[PDB]
Design a protein around this ligand. Structure first.
Ligand SMILES: Nc1ncnc2c1ncn2[C@@H]1O[C@H](COP(=O)(O)CP(=O)(O)OP(=O)(O)O)[C@@H](O)[C@H]1O
Ligand SMILES: [Mg+2]
Length: 224
């Protein structure tokens, strides 16, 4: 016989993980990117927004051939979410997303034919901006980020998280966070001295400077 139970008186989820070694020259690039000073680091955002733009082109075309592909969401766009509390900058798109095998192949495991050429150009003093011509622009994220997590959902697979703090390895895991529906979320965990990339004025400045010709709307979400 009880009139009142207190809160302290009232199941284990199981996530599968896989750990991968970066391709040798990818790992060398990452070290070079992380451990060398570059001015002009702001170009990281151009590279990530170009990737979103490419993934949005892909879904726009796939869906011409099959309206069914936009069942996972019709709106084609990019959102930028700085968070000063946890020091993350999140780039979200509703492009094609990546399958599990896409993450494993495209972000780290397969050799890229421009990496050796990029590393020589950089050691000769090329601006890191040149990274966009060498097919390795994703890694520019590590100019400003100590860790990068990629959350992604493709129509043909489940939701996956890829994550890396560099140092030769990344992980891919099944993700049961907030469901995405379709697209990719790049979550940059900013290095302590790179917090300017959480300011609304700086974000507007660099989109205006470098991402003026993007054929999808970009919205900035600013916490009050
Ligand atoms: N937002 C995103 N959505 C979907 N896939 C993405 C993505 N960001 C990155 N990727 C995947 O990661 C791959 C590698 O990206 P990058 O390092 O920028 C070279 P790229 O953009 O493919 O080269 P390119 O500029 O020569 O065309 C892309 O090709 C894509 O498969
Ligand atoms: Mg790219």
């Amino acid at each position: 016989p009880r009139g009142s139970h207190m809160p302290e008186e009232t199941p284990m989820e199981e996530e599968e993980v896989e750990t991968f070694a970066f391709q040798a020259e990818i790992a060398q690039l990452m070290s070079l990117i992380i451990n060398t000073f570059y001015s002009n680091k702001e170009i990281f955002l151009r590279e990530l927004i170009s990737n979103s733009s490419d993934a949005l082109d892909k879904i726009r075309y796939e869906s011409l051939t099959d309206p069914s592909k936009l069942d996972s969401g019709k709106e084609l766009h990019i959102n930028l979410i700085p968070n000063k509390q946890d020091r993350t900058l999140t780039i979200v798109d509703t492009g094609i997303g990546m399958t599990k095998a896409d993450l494993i192949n495209n972000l780290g495991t397969i050799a890229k034919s421009g990496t050796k050429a990029f590393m020589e150009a950089l050691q000769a003093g090329a601006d890191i901006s040149m990274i966009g011509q060498f097919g390795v622009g994703f890694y520019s994220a590590y100019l400003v980020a100590e860790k990068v997590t990629v959350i992604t959902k493709h129509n043909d697979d489940e939701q996956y998280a890829w994550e890396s703090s560099a140092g030769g390895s990344f992980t891919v895991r099944t993700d049961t966070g907030e469901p995405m529906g379709r697209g990719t979320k790049v979550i940059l965990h900013l290095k302590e001295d790179q917090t300017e990339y959480l300011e609304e004025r700086r974000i507007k400045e660099i989109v205006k400077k470098h991402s003026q010709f993007i054929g999808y709307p970009i919205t900035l979400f600013v916490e009050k």
